[model samples]
Target chain A: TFADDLASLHNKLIEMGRLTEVALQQAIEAFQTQNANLAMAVIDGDGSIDALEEEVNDFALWLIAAQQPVATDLRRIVAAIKIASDIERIADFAVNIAKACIRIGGQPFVMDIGPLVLMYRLATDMVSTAIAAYDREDASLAAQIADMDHRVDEQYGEMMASLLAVAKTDAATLAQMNVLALVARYIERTADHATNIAEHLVYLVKGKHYDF
Target chain B: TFADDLASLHNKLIEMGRLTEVALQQAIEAFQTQNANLAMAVIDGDGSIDALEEEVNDFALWLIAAQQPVATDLRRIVAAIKIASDIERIADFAVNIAKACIRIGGQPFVMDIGPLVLMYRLATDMVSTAIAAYDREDASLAAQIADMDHRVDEQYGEMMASLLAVAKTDAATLAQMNVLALVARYIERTADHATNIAEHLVYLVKGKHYDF
Candidate 1:
């Protein structure tokens, strides 16, 4: 029965993970298409994600207090708390990106969206893989996720440089590039949260902190 | 005896809080003066802050598992965990600001540092007041910290607008402005963590969540 409770918590975590994934995907789609309505939807949906985070946190804390688990079980509960916090933050980043889209006011981006699209794909994939890694307790999969994060970091740098180049030549695009740079940072941070989740998974399976 | 252990944990937290305060203070000084070595020292000292975070976390978790604290006692231990995490992140923001200083390579800022200095003072004071609030369990002081954070937010916005104004005319300062904008963000985030700690203090004293 205690194992059943743990399983239920796992399911809840996966549910929260899916919500974050959808939030991020929809936010990016809204950004790429300049859809203010979709962006607004993402912003509105964040409250539910945040509520779920509180629920997950309460459940995890309750389990810890009631069960008084030790060693590996204790680590699992701790990881659950950490993972939920990270997922909540990933959703917050989605909200940040969506707000940026709204600020752009459905206008076409002054810069190319190609790199952003690529970065979004990588970040979403990382979130998915991280959830899978946790579900399967796959330390190896978690390790692979960190390598993907490095690529995301590199792309982020490249994107920033390109945005800055545009700001130099066109003063009109300067504000737009500024906002896009923030969008890039938010996506990169989302990937970083995924990497953190993967690290927790690695710690769960290997009993050692995985440096990312 | 358990009370003694809790008191010791509280002391360790205050110690970590002081380190964070110092790291933030030195990082800002380094930024204001363009002192690369002082910035590097802040960056270097971060390792100890991180280690202390781990020590505090381990101590809190062990107490929770060993004593199986309930109700208010459980809340206090949980608050300790949350507060320590927030403090750790405050130190991280300091490290981020320090790295920005190193990135600027001790160059004179293209923009006036007046607004920045004011913002830094507000942030540092918020941190100091939050620690005092925690030490004294002063919910009223904790509530006052939120008002200070609002000022920090306004200063942050003004700083960003000024940076953008300069970026529009002076292309050379654009890169530096970007870094400085990031520095501004780190300080704003540090203030946010202080607000978080203040809220925790409120919760600790009132047994109710303080909505910020």
Candidate 2:
């Protein structure tokens, strides 16, 4: 009975994790393509993840209370709490991206989107690797995932430089430039949350905290 | 022993709550006056609140693990979790506002900061009331905090209009105007988080969830 309950809890958390990944990907795609429909889809899709987050949280609490799991099991539950927070934050980052898209709609893209695209890809890669690390309980993969966050930061710097250059030429360029810069920052933050999830994965497996 | 633990946890959470308020207030002051020193101070002070957040979270988790607190105690723990998340986001909002000041430093306040000031005041009030509600365990105060979020929304709309009007006349104004809009949006979001914290306070006190 205990094994069955643990299995159910693990499955639900994985499901929730997958939903967050979908939301994160679609969110950036929506912004890149300037598709309001995709943005709305992200907003709608968020409901399931939100509900799943709540459900998993309750299940973890019950597991701790009813079964009185200890040591390793307790670590898993604690990691779940942190993971849930990370997933919710990633979803919020998606919403921030979507809102940026809404504002950027119909406005000419004054700044080069190449760096922005690079940032998105790097962030998405981090999310993917983090989930993989969690599924496999691989500490090395988790560390690598944390390291990839630096690449996102590098891209962010490039994007900011590009934006400042644009802003210097024509003041009219400031609106879209600033918006794009913000979007890049939000995407970087999404990557940071994913890195956090990876760190928690390590904690679950090793019962120790790892920081990047 | 359990009661003592609970008391200490409550006091620490309250202390964290107050620190969050100070961070928000300093952030707004920095933005209004374009004080780089104040902005730097806010950025530097973020570390303290962040540490408090982690400490509170760890304590709450330990209490649950050790004692399996129930009903009211459970509500308090849950509220601490939720409020901690909200406070972190508000701290991030403060960082964003301070960053805005740094980016637009010494530049003429091109937009009507009046509405922005109103937003700052509303957000600060919401934070104050939410903390008061939590400390006093007053559901009514929480309810009022939730309502004031709409006032922040209304003020945001006014700022948006002012931004658009300014954009039409001064091309250079567009950049600052966009920043103003972004600032207003962040302030509105900060207030919304305060509302969420307030609702959680209501839940903590009354075991009843209030929808915002």
Candidate 3:
């Protein structure tokens, strides 16, 4: 019966992960195309993500209270709570990115958006890989996901330099540039959260904390 | 015996909270005075905070397995896990601010520092009040702490506007202004975590979540 409860909890986590992935995708699309409507939709949809997180949290707490899992099972339940929090936060970053898009309005970017798009792609991939790794309990996949975050970090650094250069040449674009930089930072942070999820998966699989 | 364990957990939380508070203070001071050494010190000290968090997390997990606390006790232990995380993140933000200070590297700020100073003061106050609320289990104090975050938000807004104006007028100062903007953002987020801690305390006391 406890095993069945865990299976159900895993299903809930998968469902939440899918929603989070969609949120990131829509937020990226909104950013790329300046789609304020899509951005607003992402903002509105955050409530659903929050609701799912609350549900997952409550269920995890309930399982802990009723089952009293020890060692690995306890770790699994605890990991669910931690991973759910990270996923919810990743969704929040997406929301923040969407808000940044809205703030950018119809104005074109002052700097090339190539680096940002690359960063977004990498971060989204990391999120997907992390969820899959957790679902399958794949330690190797999780380790690979952590390595992928380095690329996201490198892209962020490149974007920051480009944005600063643009700001130096045209001070007028600084406001929009600021928002773009913030977007890049959010994306980078999302990748970091994905890495955290990966590390959690590794812990779940190996029963040892994997520092990344 | 479980009560004794909970008390010990509370004391550990308090200790971690003090470390976080000091980190924020030193980071702010480093930013204001351009003391890279102090900034570096803050960064170095983060290891200890992190270690303590890991310890608290392990102990909490062990207690959950051994004690099987239910209802309010369950909530309190869970809150410990959440609050420890929030405090750790607050420390990370302080580390980020300190790194920004080091990155600014003797460069003068493009905009007036008054607003940033004000924001920092408010955020530090919030951290202290939130920790005090947790220590005393004072729901009213937690509510008051949440209210205080509004001022930090307002100050951050004002600071952002000023930074944008500076960027428009002076291109060379763009890099420094960028760092200042990041510092302000970190302070605002720190205030948010403090609010989170406050809300957690309210939940612990009332056995109901309070959204702030």
Model 2's TM-score against the true structure: 0.61
Q: Over the stretch B17-55, how does candidate 3's per-residue lDDT look in tens digits?
A: 888888988898898989999999998889788788878
- Between prediction 2 and prediction 3, which has the larger TM-score? 3
With candidate 2 superimposed using the best TM-score fit, by how many Å does residue B145's alpha carbon deviate from the native? Answer: 15
User: Candidate 1 residues B1-212, lDDT tens each?
Assistant: 98888898889999999889888888998988989899999988788877887788778778776777766777777778777877877787788888888888966888798898889889889988988888887888876786786687557556755654453555567777768766765676677667767767885687554443
Candidate 3: misplaced stretches above 4 Å?
A: A167-172, A207-212, B1-5, B17-73, B85-212
Better of 2 and 3 by lDDT: 3
DockQ for each numbered candidate: 0.17, 0.10, 0.15
Each candidate's clash count: 0, 0, 0
What interface RMSD does each of the candidate structures achieve?
Answer: 6.1, 8.5, 6.6
Q: Which one wins on lDDT?
A: 3
Instruction: Estimate, for each residue in B155-208, the C-alpha lDDT of model 2 and write its tens digit.
Output: 654555555444356666666665675676567557766776776676556645
Question: What is the C-alpha lDDT profile of model 1 across A41-159, one tens digit per residue?
Answer: 99888888767766776777787767876667777777786677678767877888889898879668786888888887898899899888888778788768867766775565566
Tens digits of per-residue lDDT, candidate 3, A1-212, equal 98999998988998989999999999999999999999999999888877887788788877666687766787788889878877877888888899999987987777689889989989999999999888887878876775676576546556655654443555557767767766765776677678767767875677454443
Query: How do the candidates rank by lDDT, highest first?
Result: 3, 1, 2
Full candidate order by DockQ, most accurate first: 1, 3, 2
Docking class of 2: incorrect
| Model 2 CA deviation exceeding 4 Å by range | A167-173, B1-5, B12-72, B79-212
